[PDB]
Amino acid sequence: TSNVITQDLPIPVASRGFADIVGFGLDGVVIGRNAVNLQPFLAVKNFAQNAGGWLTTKHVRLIADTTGTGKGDIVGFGNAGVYVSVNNGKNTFADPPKMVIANFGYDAGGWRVEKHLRYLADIRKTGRADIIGFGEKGVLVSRNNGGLNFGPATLVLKDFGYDAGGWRLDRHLRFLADVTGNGHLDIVGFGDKHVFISRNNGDGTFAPAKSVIDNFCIDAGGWKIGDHPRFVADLTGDGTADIIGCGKAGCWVALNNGGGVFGQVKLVINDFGTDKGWQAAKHPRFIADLTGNGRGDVVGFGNAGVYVALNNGDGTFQSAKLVLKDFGVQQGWTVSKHRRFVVDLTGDGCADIIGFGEKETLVSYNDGKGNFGPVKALTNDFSFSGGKWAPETTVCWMANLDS
Amino acid sequence: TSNVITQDLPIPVASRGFADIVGFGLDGVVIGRNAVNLQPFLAVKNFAQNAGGWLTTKHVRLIADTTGTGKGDIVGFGNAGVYVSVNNGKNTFADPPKMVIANFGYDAGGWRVEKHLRYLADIRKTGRADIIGFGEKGVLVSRNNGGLNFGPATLVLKDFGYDAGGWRLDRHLRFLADVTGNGHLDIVGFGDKHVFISRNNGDGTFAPAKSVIDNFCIDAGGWKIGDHPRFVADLTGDGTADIIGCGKAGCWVALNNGGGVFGQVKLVINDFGTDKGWQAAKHPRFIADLTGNGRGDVVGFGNAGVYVALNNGDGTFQSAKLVLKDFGVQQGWTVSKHRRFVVDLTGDGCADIIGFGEKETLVSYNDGKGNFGPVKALTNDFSFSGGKWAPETTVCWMANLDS
Ligand SMILES: CC(=O)N[C@@H]1[C@@H](O)[C@H](O)[C@@H](CO)O[C@H]1O
Ligand SMILES: CC(=O)N[C@@H]1[C@@H](O)[C@H](O)[C@@H](CO)O[C@H]1O
Ligand SMILES: CC(=O)N[C@@H]1[C@@H](O)[C@H](O)[C@@H](CO)O[C@H]1O
Ligand SMILES: CC(=O)N[C@@H]1[C@@H](O)[C@H](O)[C@@H](CO)O[C@H]1O
Ligand SMILES: CC(=O)N[C@@H]1[C@@H](O)[C@H](O)[C@@H](CO)O[C@H]1O
Ligand SMILES: CC(=O)N[C@@H]1[C@@H](O)[C@H](O)[C@@H](CO)O[C@H]1O
Ligand SMILES: CC(=O)N[C@@H]1[C@@H](O)[C@H](O)[C@@H](CO)O[C@H]1O
Ligand SMILES: CC(=O)N[C@@H]1[C@@H](O)[C@H](O)[C@@H](CO)O[C@H]1O
Ligand SMILES: CC(=O)N[C@@H]1[C@@H](O)[C@H](O)[C@@H](CO)O[C@H]1O
Ligand SMILES: CC(=O)N[C@@H]1[C@@H](O)[C@H](O)[C@@H](CO)O[C@H]1O
Ligand SMILES: CC(=O)N[C@@H]1[C@@H](O)[C@H](O)[C@@H](CO)O[C@H]1O
């Protein structure tokens, strides 16, 4: 398994553990701790549409451990900078939050959701998350120096920027993933003609980009942003991140075989591709371990419901099959109104299914083998409801509040 | 609130948090992680009646953080010494476990459940647990030197031991509690004629015993082990442990000044004592914060049900009253078959009620003011299920696996 950060899933969730619900709703942050008696509570009256003036169009809202206690904190990139509400480890979050650095904000540094990416990750393997942003002139890192002291925002690499050179959210992808196995997140960029790796130097800097694959890109295979989603994930169990994507004809995989260098692209699954009806606008696909393997499996929310193809263990896959007649288009699920995730909720290393639906937060549990049990309702909260939880003005994530 | 270690409750549980179930069953350690879909899993095939030859009459089985990751490990004092299964932070524990010191065991130092006490505590406040034993010649300490290296068992104090001067499990009480207010756990011992305290110096050693109270003892006020239970708990909210006991006429307390000097011994509740029918054999009593204000409240499982008396905040109390018609003698609950605990299950700092009954593990939830809702079944698991979970051959504890 690898700890991986993408654009669509910027909060890493443990392959084996009990994912918690974090909702940035209209009136504040609402926590649904994974627990025997689920009870959402308004934890912080901030970070919200109607409390603090937070907008999905201008701001980024996340969870990460900023103090090192192993407890996840609320983190938001607002106007004047980054704001942190600390988790005190006794189920209470600081309110009001503290502004921890005057950078990475809409007014401080001119960060834009339409041009730039902002991530939180422990890239120095020190137990706290640093701030890393793919900004204008390239990658800017701010080191987390303990007790909410964030060092200067610093240009550590003159690449992968909107203006260094030409990186666009409508053409390219930029992820963090350990492609070498040293436990440090490296940079993976899908550019125009090459997947590039920028290795992690261990000290908050990354080395210059090196081309590793001549596929999976807008001008190298014809891979378009929405239509052909791409992923980084350990598909072999060697602890290093491989590459997999859903094309036209199905799922192509490039296996990592040199601690950061890649084998040739192969079609491993005859499905999940546009050729079989899969559409950016309708059918989210994911990579998750559904078998406790340490290897990633393919999960797709299709028309009739949930499809899955299981990794044998070596990056080859069993045929796709329907495992659950729910959470698909048939049952009213839409990308505009609802959220779906594939995360372990039961600590068995076998990812489960959670959907924030029309009126209910629904779930189906992995039987521990990649099959799923009946759809159960967790709570009325976090659902679209009118929508009190519209994606336009709210944000829901799964996250392990205990690391 | 003050973290405390007692003979009945050697494992500290968070007053605000989500306590997990840990059962040392017939076939191994069964983990019951506090989560939305409680799914007990056989975590380690050891530490058990029929896996490792672990017997309730010879051995001690606990949960403590022995590595400093904040994740509770499985620790057991067996025949040849102390064995640990490390918790890796992803809900898996090493199996088999490994021996970390050939001492403090039935055949390694002649340790006896009938004569000695063995505890795991972070007495040096270094983030991981030392081994503390009250043995033959006094208090033996083994320093957790990291990475499962443990220093030689060293006699740190010639007192509180079976042969120094004559401490007896049928006459006396030995607890760990921070009474002095310096954040370190002190030895609190109820001897013949006095309650003694031994100040934790901070370095792995303990100052000589000092008499602080002429009461609460077998030869000071007529306090008997079975019939008149005693506790240490923060009753005033200053983070400093006070003393409270269920006597004949009710509950008596002596309050801590904040630095280990104790005030008068006074009667604060007219109930919970032998005079009102409370018996060692039938009616377990606890101190837990049922209102989330950081001061301990009294809870007793009597004949008709659960009785409670609420702390005003300063060691004075409201009247006792019955809050729930269950978990009592009349409903079949017996010490010989069943387990009852009062712990926060929901993260609101208000202790809830959980009982391992004849056929089910049942729960009643605190409403946040010390009242309790309808009784719900959490699972068939961990219940007596005759006699899959008999107390003669199995051990159930509550604990916070994630700290
Ligand atoms: C979107 C944004 O930045 N909102 C912040 C709010 O969270 C914060 O509490 C306040 C500081 O007083 O400033 C507001 O502008
Ligand atoms: C979007 C972006 O890159 N903003 C950066 C800002 O964080 C930095 O402080 C400043 C000076 O180096 O340069 C800006 O371009
Ligand atoms: C959008 C894109 O792919 N840009 C890449 C750039 O990141 C990299 O530095 C360079 C290596 O020559 O190749 C460029 O064209
Ligand atoms: C978009 C979608 O749901 N595609 C599925 C395809 O993956 C599957 O192979 C087939 C089952 O026969 O049915 C199609 O509808
Ligand atoms: C869009 C949505 O939420 N669809 C759900 C469906 O998944 C579920 O099977 C059903 C019964 O709970 O309720 C529907 O509303
Ligand atoms: C009660 C006891 O000590 N049992 C231990 C067991 O935990 C261990 O796995 C085994 C192998 O060394 O040795 C046994 O004696
Ligand atoms: C029960 C007990 O105290 N046993 C101890 C043993 O742990 C220690 O190793 C030895 C030498 O100090 O002395 C014994 O009395
Ligand atoms: C059982 C008991 O109380 N023993 C105590 C001993 O621990 C203490 O060191 C001494 C102080 O004078 O008094 C003894 O009687
Ligand atoms: C076991 C018990 O209740 N003993 C108490 C004693 O603590 C108290 O000092 C005394 C006052 O007269 O009354 C006794 O009954
Ligand atoms: C052991 C027991 O249940 N004793 C209770 C006592 O605490 C209570 O004050 C009284 C009146 O409700 O009823 C007694 O039987
Ligand atoms: C000892 C025991 O488990 N007693 C329970 C009782 O508390 C519960 O109210 C009832 C209904 O579930 O079932 C009894 O057997």
Author numbering:
A (entry chain B), B (entry chain A): 2 to 404
How does the study describe this entry?
In this paper, we report the crystal structures of a lectin from Agrocybe aegerita, designated as AAL2, in its apo- and complex forms with GlcNAc and GlcNAcβ1-3Galβ1-4GlcNAc, as part of our endeavors to develop a system to facilitate the identification and purification of O-GlcNAcylated proteins. AAL2 was recently discovered from the fruit body of the edible mushroom A. aegerita. AAL2 was found to specifically bind nonreducing terminal N-acetylglucosamine (GlcNAc) moieties of either alpha- or beta-linkage and was reported to have the activity of inducing apoptosis in hepatoma cells in vitro as well as inhibiting hepatoma growth in tumour-bearing mice in vivo. The overall structure of AAL2 monomer is a single domain with the shape of cylindrical torus with a diameter of about 51Å and a height of about 27Å, showing a very regular, seven-bladed β-propeller fold formed by the blades packing in a circular array.
The structures of AAL2, AAL2-GlcNAc and AAL2-GlcNAcβ1-3Galβ1-4GlcNAc were determined at resolutions of 2.0Å, 2.1Å, and 2.0Å, respectively. There are two virtually identical AAL2 monomers arranged around a two-fold pseudoaxis of symmetry in an asymmetric unit in both the structures of AAL2 and AAL2-GlcNAc, and one AAL2 monomer in AAL2-GlcNAcβ1-3Galβ1-4GlcNAc, while the protein exists as monomers in solution as determined from its elution volume on a Superdex 200 10/300 GL column. The structure of AAL2-GlcNAc complex revealed six binding sites out of the seven W-motifs, with the exception of motif WI. Glycan ligands are bound in shallow pockets located on the entrance side, between the connecting segment and the 2–3 loop of each W-motifs (except for WI). The binding pocket for GlcNAc consists of two parts. The major part is formed by the segment connecting WII and WIII, including the side chains of Asn104, Trp112 and His117 and main chain atoms of Gly110 and Gly111. The other part is formed by the main chain atoms of Gly136, Glu137, and Lys138 from the 2–3 loop of WIII. With the presence of both the polar and hydrophobic interactions, GlcNAc is bound tightly in the shallow pocket formed on the protein surface, with the head of N-acetyl group buried inside the pocket and the reduced O1 as well as O6 hydroxyl pointing outside into the solvent region. In addition to glycans, AAL2 also binds two cations per molecule as observed in the structure of AAL2-GlcNAc complex. Similar metal ion binding properties were also observed for PVL. These cations are located in the 1–2 loops of WV and WVII of AAL2, where highly negatively-charged cages are formed.
